[model samples]
Target chain A: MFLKVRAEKRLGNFRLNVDFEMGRDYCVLLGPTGAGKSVFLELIAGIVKPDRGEVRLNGADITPLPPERRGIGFVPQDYALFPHLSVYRNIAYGLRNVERVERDRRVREMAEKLGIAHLLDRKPARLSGGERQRVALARALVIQPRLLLLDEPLSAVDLKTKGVLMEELRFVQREFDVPILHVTHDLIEAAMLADEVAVMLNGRIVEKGKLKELFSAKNGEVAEFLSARNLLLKVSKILD
Target chain B: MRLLFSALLALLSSIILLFVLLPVAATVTLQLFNFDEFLKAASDPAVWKVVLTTYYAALISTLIAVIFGTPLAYILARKSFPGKSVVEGIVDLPVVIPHTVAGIALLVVFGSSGLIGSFSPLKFVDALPGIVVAMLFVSVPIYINQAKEGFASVDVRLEHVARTLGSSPLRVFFTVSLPLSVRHIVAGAIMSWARGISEFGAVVVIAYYPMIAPTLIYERYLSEGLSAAMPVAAILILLSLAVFVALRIIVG
Candidate 1:
């Protein structure tokens, strides 16, 4: 496994407990909006600590590590792009630990790869939604993280932007070839992006498989949540 | 409807605008007519000395507020502890208390023959240190509360992302949190400094020997009546207006 986790965390009224493992491919943690998915990502990225249990990366325990030492890249919801920095500087932020020439090379290379090199001089506030997403992606990927944790990466864009970005997400996975654990509520997004989809409900992953395969065999709470549309229709018909 | 709404808003808002402007305008206008008297007060070495003392003391207190208040503001902004609200209320207590009452409370702790002052060689009663403590006491809530609001407005996600990108907590604070909240901090510092300069009741209880601008103006009003006081007050207003307006523009 590229990444393995058995973690528990409590925040006020909510609790997150999960035992998860991912092979070195693009995995999607498919969960509904409040299934503690964001907290899950934060836990792995070391932004939030687990109350107990371990995070093992490449078979080494990293539970004691802080975010700075964990070698993980994170793109939180709304991108969390530094509004004060230029696009170039935002992407170059993590590269400060590197040599000047290498930092410049990596920043420019990632910017070009994400088709954002032309927008380098501008601040994040000036960028369009799709452009902002690309800049956030560039900033994360340029760090060469062991794992890229994306929290609702495509949920903000228009449908038109979503289609193109879906393709780009695939292209990025192949190019950078880093294991990615992206979280989203949309089954269609999972169908298009996930190499392996893990179904999360009530703070736990209940099923794991290919998106189509999971759709075919979904049962119990996973079936109930994923088929919420049918449940809505049934209730509406009964009201009629 | 739109016309009536616009007219009423303009009408109501001008009450406050005029209420604020009227006194300063009247003072400056009256001074302009008695130009020589204004000149005489403006050129008085005593007036100049008090003005400088007020400004320098206020400056030092403002710096003290920034240096100490900033970390507390950040902690209040970021963390939620058992007694967080109590801590916040304590920080805000000075704003609610009467300035004279605040002076008395401070005096008990900082005054000569009091808890801290008795052991220390540095005199607080009738001294510059006393003046600074008085000013700091009355003005710190404004500085801390404004700065806390500023820090709260910054998105925590940005700090989290910065940390995940290999930034230490302090590095993230310097790179992301502090820079983002600077506008509020600067605004707070100015308001606090102005508040300190305007203090008279608190400063009077502690230090009255080297009077601040407001104290000097008060002494003039009492010892030499309204006409003697008017020019000095006008000079103080003009000086404050100049500094405040210029700083406001630069910060804006």
Candidate 2:
């Protein structure tokens, strides 16, 4: 499935304008903090209505649709797992009205795939941060969404677990074969996962192409930011 | 010098604690000294009726508060519009008003010749409904304020996530928001019920003949003396304490 968005919103003093398209690839939106990255995801998820413009899913205008009918999965920055629900119930939260046997089967399949089968009886509060992230991902994907939106999915993990979590995330994306729009500010994370990169600056996409092209393009804000990020990472590695 | 200062602070705090505990200890001890009188008062059918009236009225008022105030609490917690602060102040107005004045304010609107009572068939003056309405008017703010804080404590992002996962707004509220805040709502209801039970001035003006426990206590003191009222007051306090502890356990 393809997703198309061209939207503008003004929240108090900050103005956001995002225009992009994604088609069955890991599309990473790389931007500095406060560049309206999350707002872009919200527009597609139908959480926030744009003052002007439309969101289309596979050539159908879904701008008027409510969030529940949009068939889009969203994993927020904090991995908003329901604290009161056990892992099994959290995974089945989206699949309302299904038969009990089918619901349990689906929940078990997702939990096993996410390596959280042992945590099925545990509440979100009892799970570690990485465990909570997996539960959030499982909950989002159990509904079989056409598109998935992840906001800083690995940002909360410690350095030791970040690499393992990223690999798991990439594996999940490829296994599900769903178009993923991953939003992040970390250049390394963007380069690591993105099949196509959209560099946002001041709420607009300043450049869009393969990751290598954006990194090697003629001097610009996006190129400079990536270069600076690489240099900082290198210095930190040498220090370590 | 520091040790001396610490000792002085401890002494002052102990005195304040003693000030609170002393009256309760004295009341219980005095009642214990007259155990036969206590048993007699406790066995009186009149006392049982008064106790039942007090608790029944309190429970009804608290249920009414929860039913009506929960939506208002959620709205106040989640929305910000013009005059929002004014609305909140109006909710809290009862807490600051003297109970006698609260009684009079309620009487003006709910009294036999007042607007609602004048047109409505349900009598407010010298009636059970009047007692309940008065208790509710005085005690509802505690429930609303606590419930509002409870709802506010829940993260809004959780609701958004639930909605994006294909749950409607109403579903999200019932399935996520309400369960997460159930503890606070229960706590608030208990406090409102406790406050309602202690209501005297308002209940007296509205329906004194029904003779709730507090009103009975006052009448006993008037007809007899402090000795005659002590046993009933002691029993009420013990019952309230027991219920408070039981509810805390259930909620936790």
DockQ for each numbered candidate: 0.81, 0.91
On residues B92-210, what C-alpha lDDT tens digit does candidate 2 reach at each position? 99989999888888888888777888887888777778899889999999999989988998998898899998999999989988998998888899999999999999879878898
* Deviation in Å, model 1, residue A58 alpha carbon: 1.6
Q: Give every collision pair in model 1.
A: none
TM-score of each: 0.94, 0.95
Maximum-TM-score candidate: 2
Cα shift from native, residue A190, model 1 (Å): 0.7
Number of the predicted model whose lDDT against the real structure is largest? 1
lDDT of candidate 1 at residue B136, scale 0 to 100:
95
Report model 2's TM-score to 2 decimal places: 0.95
lDDT of 2 at B67: 95
The C-alpha stretches of model 1 lying farther than 4 A from their native spots are A227-240, B1-13
